[PDB]
Amino acid sequence: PTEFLYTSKIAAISWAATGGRQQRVYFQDLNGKIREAQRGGDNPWTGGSSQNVIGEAKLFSPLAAVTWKSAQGIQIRVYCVNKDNILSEFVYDGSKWITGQLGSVGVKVGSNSKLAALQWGGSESAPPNIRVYYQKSNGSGSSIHEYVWSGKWTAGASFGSTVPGTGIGATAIGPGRLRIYYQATDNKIREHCWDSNSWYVGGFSASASAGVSIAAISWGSTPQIRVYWQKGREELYEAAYGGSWNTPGQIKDASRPTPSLPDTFIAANSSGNIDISVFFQASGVSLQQWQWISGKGWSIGAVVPTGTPAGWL
Amino acid sequence: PTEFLYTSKIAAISWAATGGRQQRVYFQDLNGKIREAQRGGDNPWTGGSSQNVIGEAKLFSPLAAVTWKSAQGIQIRVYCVNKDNILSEFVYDGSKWITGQLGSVGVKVGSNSKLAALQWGGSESAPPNIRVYYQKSNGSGSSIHEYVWSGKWTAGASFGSTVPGTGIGATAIGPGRLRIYYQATDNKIREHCWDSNSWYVGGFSASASAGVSIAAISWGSTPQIRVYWQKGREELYEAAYGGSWNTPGQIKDASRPTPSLPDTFIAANSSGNIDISVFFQASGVSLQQWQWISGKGWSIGAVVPTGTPAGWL
Ligand SMILES: CO[C@@H]1O[C@@H](C)[C@@H](O)[C@@H](O)[C@@H]1O
Ligand SMILES: CO[C@@H]1O[C@@H](C)[C@@H](O)[C@@H](O)[C@@H]1O
Ligand SMILES: CO[C@@H]1O[C@@H](C)[C@@H](O)[C@@H](O)[C@@H]1O
Ligand SMILES: CO[C@@H]1O[C@@H](C)[C@@H](O)[C@@H](O)[C@@H]1O
Ligand SMILES: CO[C@@H]1O[C@@H](C)[C@@H](O)[C@@H](O)[C@@H]1O
Ligand SMILES: CO[C@@H]1O[C@@H](C)[C@@H](O)[C@@H](O)[C@@H]1O
Ligand SMILES: CO[C@@H]1O[C@@H](C)[C@@H](O)[C@@H](O)[C@@H]1O
Ligand SMILES: CO[C@@H]1O[C@@H](C)[C@@H](O)[C@@H](O)[C@@H]1O
Ligand SMILES: CO[C@@H]1O[C@@H](C)[C@@H](O)[C@@H](O)[C@@H]1O
Ligand SMILES: CO[C@@H]1O[C@@H](C)[C@@H](O)[C@@H](O)[C@@H]1O
């Protein structure tokens, strides 16, 4: 066994690095702490133990994360909710983990809400712009709400009418250009868009099983967008945009059918042009991922460590 | 969500009572504590919360339990293992829960061992006789070992050659008459027997999926024996002895196929003539049971409460 909480949410980030791409993945342990595992290049994953705690949250808290590089080092923000269902944030400030300012705002989250986050613009010569997406209510038809950091936290938009506790994918497809994916009450995944000065309904839609976990990434100049969804113990789906949307397809391995456990979640990261990881939870209880390689395709990669309880090896 | 640890082992007991049969079920929470839930007659289940802790054990500890009535009240013994893989015992002494004497003996248990226990003879006019079954080693071909209480703890028999971490069912089919069920290295469930002065190989056998969780009960004068086995997310099987063994059959509900989660465990209790519960773990994460009623048959009964984490209703 491991210390990975069954039906923990997952969050993941990636960035380019001299010597190999850096990845971090966040998950919850049996004690409610949020742990980090790390990967550099194709070296074995590290971390995931009781010595890798970065924060804590209510048991079964939703999670989301973003990163950028600043003059102070690598910045990471991990979003979660506390035991009072208040939206909360852990900060890696370039050198240490601390509690961030978002928790003091008092944003109430529905108990079954998921979280998504995106960021654009942050660098060693420009400030970050963060957007966090959440729900206030658990019921069918609830909207998605946005909290905004472009110098200070303030409320943003609300939109959509969703399945209860919908999955939410969020990606900045270009500077100040946002795409948000969620599952509407007809079980179709839908898209909401911001290009300049307003939100509008996007052209993407796809039928999916009720209650799928959703993630989204993007890169490049077209731009390229990939939207992932998965119901636990069903195969992963991807929809791809390269100027138009393709027909969604399954990412699967005939020797390892439907490798996730029931009622589990996914997360995706990306960096470069292009490296992609899609994390899932499997028997073990293990943290697994799909990986994309151009000219090999998709495969299940190395297992991410998630601790070993006392009394076991 | 609940506080029921996913892939927790389960133990259960039952006894006849004026006003309705009493049941207790034991399971592990996310903190490693062993909790109790209670039922009287067909009234709703109670307990299962953080206020119902009876002991603690290593995370994912095996569990077993027995009960009898004494001059001091209802006696319960719950077997588990600590963080050093030492066989341990919690005692309900008729009025309170305390730590029992078995832990001080120093019986090492294989980290992946299951536990079973049986009892006969204990009453308000006779002392109890307890037997606890465990494994020392995790590997294929390991034996089952027995620890014995008939006034003080001492080692008993060892027998069998099993699948790694085999399920173990144990029942006293009559006074000092024992039947032990386990899965041998050919994946057949096999039977070991004690009637008077020696162990011998029994006539029961049945093919089963590798790694099934096993439970066994018995009652009456024939006697009647029932052996249960289940692999997580497969249907429950029962083999029945009433003088001869029947062909094993599935206990299932066409509207709720394979209702347990992968890699989960079962436990059975019985009392009277006859009331039977077979507990399993399902999405929720929930503690469920099959129940037998003469002239209705088998059905899935009321859900057993297993707590609600803070931040959820
Ligand atoms: C150098 O430190 C490593 O990388 C940082 C960006 C953080 O992810 C930190 O938790 C990790 O230990
Ligand atoms: C400087 O403040 C830190 O970084 C900002 C970009 C926000 O993530 C804020 O909540 C956090 O406390
Ligand atoms: C300028 O407007 C703010 O930033 C945009 C990119 C959107 O996140 C919008 O909902 C928010 O109010
Ligand atoms: C112009 O079209 C809009 O932007 C594209 C990048 C896609 O997100 C598409 O689904 C959306 O309707
Ligand atoms: C070139 O292939 C396309 O882009 C890759 C980065 C993957 O998203 C793949 O599933 C998709 O078909
Ligand atoms: C009266 O007390 C109830 O029954 C006893 C036999 C024990 O199961 C105890 O934990 C429970 O609360
Ligand atoms: C009196 O001693 C108690 O009851 C016996 C029957 C045993 O269960 C023993 O380990 C326990 O401490
Ligand atoms: C008398 O022998 C003891 O009791 C029997 C009923 C068996 O449990 C045996 O293995 C044990 O040594
Ligand atoms: C006499 O036969 C023995 O006892 C019966 C009660 C059964 O346990 C049977 O499988 C075993 O071989
Ligand atoms: C009378 O029916 C037999 O005994 C019952 C108590 C159950 O064990 C049932 O599955 C079995 O077929």
Residue numbers in the entry:
A (entry chain A), B (entry chain A): 1 to 313
Task: Copy text verbatim from the article accompanying this structure deposition.
Lectins are carbohydrate-binding proteins that are widely used in medicinal research for lectin-staining of cells and tissues as well as for glycoprotein analysis. One of the predominantly used lectins is AAL from Aleuria aurantia—the first fungal lectin with a solved 3D structure. It combines high affinity towards fucose and fucosylated oligosaccharides with an ability to recognize core fucosylated oligosaccharides with α1–6 linked fucose.
In this study, we present the high resolution X-ray structure of the AALN224Q lectin complex with α-methyl-l-fucoside where the Trp side chain is found in both conformations. All five binding sites are very similar and the main difference among them is that three of them contain the Trp residue which creates CH-π stacking interaction with bound Fuc residue, whereas the remaining two binding sites contain the Tyr residue which also creates CH-π interaction. The single point mutation N224Q reported previously to affect the binding affinity of site 5 is not directly involved in ligand binding. In binding Site3, where CH-π interaction is also mediated by tryptophan residue (Trp194), only g(‒) conformation was found. This is stabilized by a water molecule bridge between NE1 of Trp194 and the backbone O of Gly176. The observed Eint suggest that both stacking Trp conformations are equivalent in strength even though they create slightly different interactions with αMeFuc.
